[PDB]
């Protein structure tokens, strides 16, 4: 279903609160994003990890140069956090993503996996900044 898949969709507004938070390769790795490829067609890709690009760009108020190593079945390339859209996974896009996953041979993640992974972002949002992370963030 597309409705259950949109629970872990990392919108463009949520990513602005974890631009310098540690453990970025643990909570983010597993969710899906509607990266804009482009004319209005979109392609859902899996978050394999985290990369850093050499180009610095501004995203509204804040600004980050980090990349996002995504992959849609087999085609993989470097992307940016500015091209991500806030729209939800449509039925056509969901069917295209399912077909790409079936063709690539990657097993579809189980429903329990998404159910237990959606809580990671919720628990990280309310995380008390008691340790020594503010200094790294400001630096």
């Amino acid at each position: 279903l597309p409705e259950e898949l949109n629970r872990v969709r990392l919108s463009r507004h949520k990513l602005e609160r974890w631009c310098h938070m540690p453990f970025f390769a643990k909570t983010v790795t597993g969710c899906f994003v509607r990266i804009g490829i482009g004319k209005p067609v979109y392609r859902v890709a899996e978050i394999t990890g985290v990369v850093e690009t050499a180009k610095v760009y501004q995203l509204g108020g804040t600004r980050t140069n980090k990349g996002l190593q995504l992959r849609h079945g087999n085609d993989q390339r470097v992307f940016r956090l500015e091209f991500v859209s806030n729209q939800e996974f449509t039925e056509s896009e969901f069917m295209k993503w399912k077909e790409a996953m079936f063709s690539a041979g990657m097993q579809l993640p189980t429903l329990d996996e998404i159910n237990k992974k959606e809580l990671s972002i919720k628990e990280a949002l309310n995380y008390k900044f008691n340790d020594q992370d503010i200094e790294e963030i400001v630096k």
């Binding site: 008390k128 900044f129 008691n130 503010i134 200094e135 963030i137 400001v138």
Partner: protein
């Protein structure tokens, strides 16, 4: 759902500060920061 929005000292940048947290700004890092105007019905009589 009010995260107690505060304003930095010199940078004048909005910061979300909760209880049991150090009072430091999201960048640079200072120790002085003020609050925002209330949302109440501030109504004066021009007398």
């Amino acid at each position: 759902q009010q995260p107690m929005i505060y304003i930095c000292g010199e940078c004048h940048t909005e910061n979300e500060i909760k209880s049991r947290d150090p009072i430091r700004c999201r960048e640079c890092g200072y120790r002085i920061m003020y609050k925002k105007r209330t949302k109440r019905l501030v109504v004066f009589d021009a007398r």
